[PDB]
């Protein structure tokens, strides 16, 4: 997260760190959506142009974390993967369309002051909140600059951007399964996700029922916090049918 700030304790208790077993590194962000299901970006698991292809036993989910590098004894819980499910029409060849994946945990995680699931949107929520100018919140342990790393979880609030501005900011083909967020150069304020924030949640707090919903997944950008560029996010509600089917099946 570039130009964000330290998170408060318990501020994003659905935050998950995907952690590589060997070598022990940050792989990506993710989010807790029930006591046994974790949501992330498919590119966190599968990205053949970079030879990335991870299976269940290559990693661990760390939940309830605040510090990036420390083993937060008596606070975080570290879980094992039972199965990974990537969207079957995830488009890694082109533009990362449908950049979404689910991971089922071997055992349920216990909720705590630091560990709690976020909500997924239904149609009225998405239509209500996914509006140009409405701000969401992105969190992660990723890079602080485009070209080091944070001691603790970072947070940034960013406004959703009109579809035409998003499209005009890039040569890439934007789909209905994406949205972009960030301040325009004219707006003066700053902030973006970046390398390492991949997979983590873009959340909004409904003013109707005062619950936090995950509207987006950190998916891609060109550089980080660059003037006139925006961050691109997976549109969680557009892929909700697939999420339901996988959870209902497995």
């Amino acid at each position: 997260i570039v130009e964000g700030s330290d998170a408060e304790i318990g501020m994003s208790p659905w935050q998950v760190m995907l952690f590589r077993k060997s070598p022990q590194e940050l792989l990506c962000g993710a989010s807790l959506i029930s006591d046994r299901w974790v949501l992330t970006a498919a590119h966190c698991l599968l990205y053949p142009p970079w030879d990335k292809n991870f299976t269940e036993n290559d990693l661990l989910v760390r939940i309830g974390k605040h510090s990036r590098t420390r083993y937060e004894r008596n606070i975080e819980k570290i879980s094992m993967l039972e199965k990974i499910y990537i969207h079957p029409r995830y488009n890694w060849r082109e533009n990362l369309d449908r950049d979404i994946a689910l991971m089922k945990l071997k055992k349920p995680v216990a909720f705590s002051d630091y560990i709690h699931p976020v909500c997924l949107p239904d149609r009225e929520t998405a239509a209500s909140l996914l509006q140009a100018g409405y701000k969401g919140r992105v969190t992660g342990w990723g890079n602080l600059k485009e070209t080091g790393q944070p001691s603790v979880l970072q947070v940034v609030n960013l406004p959703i951007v009109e579809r035409p501005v998003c499209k005009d900011s890039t040569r890439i083909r934007i789909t209905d399964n994406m949205f972009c967020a960030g301040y325009k150069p004219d707006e003066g304020k700053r902030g973006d996700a970046c390398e390492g924030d991949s997979g983590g949640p873009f959340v909004m707090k409904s003013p109707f029922n005062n619950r936090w919903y995950q509207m987006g997944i950190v998916s891609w950008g060109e550089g980080c916090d660059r003037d006139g560029k925006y961050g691109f996010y997976t549109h969680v509600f557009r892929l909700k049918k697939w999420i339901q089917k996988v959870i209902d099946q497995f």
């Binding site: 700030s5 408060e8 304790i9 318990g10 501020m11 208790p13 959506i33 029930s34 006591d35 909720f111 705590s112 002051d113 630091y114 709690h116 699931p117 976020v118 909500c119 997924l120 209500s128 909140l129 509006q131 100018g133 409405y134 701000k135 969401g136 919140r137 947070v155 609030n157 406004p159 909004m204 707090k205 003013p207 005062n210 619950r211 936090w212 919903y213």
Partner: peptide
């Protein structure tokens, strides 16, 4: 989870975090 999206250290004890009001002020409808 019928209790999703309600944080033990914030919503569940009627405490607000430092920048959530910023989101609320952007939700102009």
């Amino acid at each position: 989870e019928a209790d999703c999206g309600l944080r033990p250290l914030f919503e569940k004890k009627s405490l607000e975090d430092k920048t959530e009001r910023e989101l609320l002020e952007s939700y102009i409808d």
